[PDB]
Write a protein that binds this DNA or RNA. Sequence first.
RNA 1: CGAAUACGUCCCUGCUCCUUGCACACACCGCCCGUCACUCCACCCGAGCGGGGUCCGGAUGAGGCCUGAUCUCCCUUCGGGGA
Length: 66
Amino acid sequence: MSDEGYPAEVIEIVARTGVTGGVTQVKVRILEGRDKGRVIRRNVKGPVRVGDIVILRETEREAREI
RNA sequence: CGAAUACGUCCCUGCUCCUUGCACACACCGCCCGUCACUCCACCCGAGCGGGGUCCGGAUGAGGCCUGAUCUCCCUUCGGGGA
C-alpha cells in the first residue's frame, strides 16, 4: 500500500526545530508528480542525511522559519 | 547472553554565566504596612467646679487739699490772727 505520496529528495539541512529538538527543518526537492524540481521547505521528524528521500502526502504546505 | 533509540533540545526539572531592577545583606524561609487588643507616656477637644487679673459701666465712696456759714478756745498793737 502506497497512496498518492510524492517523493522528495533532501538537498540541504537547516536548523533543528521542535519544542524538544526532535524535529529538523529541511530543504527538499520533489522528484515526481507535476513539480519535478520545485524545492520546498518541510519539517521532518527523525534522522536525516542529505540524499535521503521523504515522501509527502502533499506539497502545498511550506512551513518556513529561521 | 546482549539490545532499542537520539547523535538532538531547553518544553519540564535543575545548574553556570551575562545583563537589568531592588526599600534585601543572619541576604525572599528577606524586608515591611495598617486596623484591633495589653502596659506606660504627654498632648489636645473639653461638660462641670473653684479662684485671680483686666475693660466697661452703674451705684456708694474713706480720707486729704480748696473754699462759705456757724460754734468753741488762745493771742492780741483791737487791725485781726491761729488751732
